[PDB]
């Protein structure tokens, strides 16, 4: 997967074909993060084939709908569990973010795994994402925003070069 | 403004540059007449960029405008009065030339017979006295 743009949470269910041996298969369900629902119903068969004896020929999906959050305005803390690949071996990883939505924090993970650990999006498997409540966070960068009456200024502001004239007689103050 | 033929279209020509032979600037034992290059390693036959172009049938001119003179006529060189009279029923589409061997005595008479017959001659005032 390329994880192009912001990601998007999907609920995908599906079940294997009803054989003459087995009628009514159990119809499993997953939680896929993908940029569109064609990739999402492809990522469903990547994980289901790793856990059950199902594949796209001998199964189908019976729902692929975008599930999205019941509070896009509340600020939430997300702790997520990872299974990325490194150059030497593969690792388990816990990781905490802070965003207004589930899909925007997992997008913030793939940007961060590429930034810190150089881990490409085909090599990292999200295990579970859930919103966690404060005083159960363990990452002190997320923890330092838990402050009622939090305050800081903006130091040393820079933007808008060449738009405001390339050639001016005016040394631009950085506040 | 002499005899003003029938409908003259806008002559496109696809090229006005007279294809020259390769390595003909460099020698004078090589005339400018086109020969196509048949060498195994040269760059004009193998058609690299920025080099001497080579003719093909794609440069050919429009069939309704081929052999048109810049005045709008199509020449037909004559030698006497009698084959100037063969150009009577085509005088608004074709024109006559007097050949270079016709003497100034006989060229004087066949340049007046063409004016009666309303034929444009392309060299009317050649070899005057």
């Amino acid at each position: 997967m390329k994880a192009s743009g912001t990601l998007r949470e999907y609920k995908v269910v599906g079940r294997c074909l009803p054989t003459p041996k087995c009628h009514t298969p159990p119809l499993y369900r997953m939680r896929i993060f993908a940029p569109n629902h064609v990739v999402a119903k492809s990522r469903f068969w990547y994980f289901v084939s790793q856990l059950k004896k199902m594949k796209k020929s001998s199964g189908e999906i019976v729902y692929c709908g975008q599930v999205f959050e019941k509070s896009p305005l509340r600020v939430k803390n997300f702790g997520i569990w990872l299974r990325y690949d490194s150059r030497s071996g593969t690792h388990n990883m816990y990781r905490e973010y802070r965003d207004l939505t589930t899909a925007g924090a997992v997008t913030q993970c793939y940007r961060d795994m590429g930034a810190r650990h150089r881990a490409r999006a085909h090599s990292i498997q999200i295990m579970k994402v859930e919103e966690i409540a404060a005083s159960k966070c363990r990452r002190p960068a997320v923890k330092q925003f838990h402050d009622s009456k939090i305050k800081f200024p903006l130091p040393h502001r820079v933007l808008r070069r060449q738009h405001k004239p390339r050639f001016t007689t005016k040394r631009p103050n950085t506040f | 403004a002499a005899l003003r033929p029938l409908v003259k279209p806008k002559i496109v020509k696809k090229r006005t540059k007279k294809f020259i032979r390769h390595q003909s600037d460099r020698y004078v034992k090589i005339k400018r007449n086109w020969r196509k290059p048949r060498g195994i390693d040269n760059r004009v036959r193998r058609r690299f960029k920025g080099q001497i172009l080579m003719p093909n049938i794609g440069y050919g001119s429009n069939k309704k405008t081929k052999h048109m003179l810049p005045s709008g006529f199509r020449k037909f060189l004559v030698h006497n009065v009698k084959e100037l009279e063969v150009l009577l029923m085509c005088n608004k589409s074709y024109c006559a030339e007097i050949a270079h061997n016709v003497s100034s005595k006989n060229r004087k008479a066949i340049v007046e017979r063409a004016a009666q017959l309303a034929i444009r001659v392309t060299n009317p005032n050649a070899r005057l006295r």
Partner: protein
């Protein structure tokens, strides 16, 4: 078999009057069926962690 039970099933459509279409077709795309999750709710599965 499907020249024997095809010639005779051709002449069953002449006594009964129909258009059985005895030529075989490949596997068609699947019909719009209807699945049922009666009683329960679907199973949430998730990828296992890595341990050697």
């Amino acid at each position: 078999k499907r020249v024997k039970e095809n010639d005779q099933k051709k002449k069953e459509a002449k006594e009964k009057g129909t258009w059985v279409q005895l030529k075989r077709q490949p596997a068609p795309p699947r019909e719009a069926h209807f699945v049922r999750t009666n009683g329960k709710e679907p199973e949430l599965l998730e990828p296992i962690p890595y341990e050697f």
